[PDB]
Structure 1
Amino acid sequence: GSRSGVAVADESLTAFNDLKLGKKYKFILFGLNDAKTEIVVKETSTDPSYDAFLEKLPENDCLYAIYDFEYEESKIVFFTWSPDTAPVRSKMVYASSKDALRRALNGVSTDVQGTDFSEVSYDSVLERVSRG
């Protein structure tokens, strides 16, 4: 790694706070920039459908996500998305960089380690969020 390691882009923290306090977004997808020096915003969404969220997860690549998980309650959920079929290089750098983003985000209720689509299903996440 570099001397300072990966940084969190200002836009990423801004987007997170806008979601957390303003409900500006339903979810945010974060990723490493191509230089692998910063965690940036890949995409935001206001789509209320959980399926719309799942359909944006790359089947063979990694990302991080924050989801405003709503049910009947609104809980901030952090996802690490690291599918089994992603390249080893990618899995490793996303694992090594995760702490930089995760430690920068205050107010996450639940963390999900997503390695397949069963682990990130709405029902699986609801079970996690509602227990703890």
Structure 2
Amino acid sequence: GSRSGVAVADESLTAFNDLKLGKKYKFILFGLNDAKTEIVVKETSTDPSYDAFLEKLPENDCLYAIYDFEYEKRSDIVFFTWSPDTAPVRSKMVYASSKDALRRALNGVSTDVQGTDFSEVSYDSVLERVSRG
């Protein structure tokens, strides 16, 4: 790692706050920049469909996500690590090494999901996690 390690980009925190407090986005996808020095916003979305979210997860690459998980009204902020088994090993490793920098910067997450396949991130699987407590 570098001396300071990966930073969370200002835009990532701004987007998170806009979702959390403003409902500006339904979800945010975050990733490492190509320099592997900052966690940046890959994409935001206002699509209410959980399938539209799933359909944006790269089948063979990693990301992080925040989802405003709504169910009956309740709204819980869910953090995902997305690290599918078919992603390259060095990518899984750097996403794992960098996760804490983002995750510790985001206040107000209710539930975490360690997504390694599509079953683990299904709506019903996430509902079970958010609901249990």
- Quick check: TM above 0.5? yes
Q: CA RMSD in A?
A: 0.4
The percentage of counterpart residues that share the same residue type is 98
User: May I ask how many residue pairs the two structures share in their alignment?
Assistant: 132
- How far apart are residue 13 of structure 1 and its match? 0.1
State the match for 1:96 in structure 2.
97
- How far apart are residue 21 of structure 1 and its match? 0.1
Question: C-alpha deviations, 1:7-51, integer Å up to 9, x for none?
Answer: 000000000000000000000000000000000000000000000
- How far apart, CA to CA, are the structure 1 residues paired with 2:131 and 2:9? 31
Aligned to 2:93, what secondary structure does the other structure show? Answer: helix
State the match for 2:20 in structure 1.
20
Aligned to 1:13, what secondary structure does the other structure show? Answer: helix
Gaps of 5+ in 2: none
**1:40 maps to 2:40:** yes
Aligned to 1:78, what secondary structure does the other structure show? Answer: strand
- How far apart are residue 60 of structure 1 and its match? 0.1
Equivalent runs, 1:1-132 vs 2, <5 Å: 1-73=1-73, 74-132=75-133
- How far apart, CA to CA, are the structure 1 residues paired with 2:2 and 2:22? 34
Aligned to 1:51, what secondary structure does the other structure show? Answer: helix
Gaps of 5+ in 1: none
- How far apart, CA to CA, are the structure 1 residues paired with 2:110 and 2:132? 11
TM-score between the two structures when normalised by the length of structure 2: 0.99
TM-score between the two structures when normalised by the length of structure 1: 0.99
* Runs (4+) off by over 3 Å: none
Aligned to 1:58, what secondary structure does the other structure show? Answer: coil
Aligned to 2:72, what secondary structure does the other structure show? Answer: coil
Aligned to 1:124, what secondary structure does the other structure show? Answer: helix
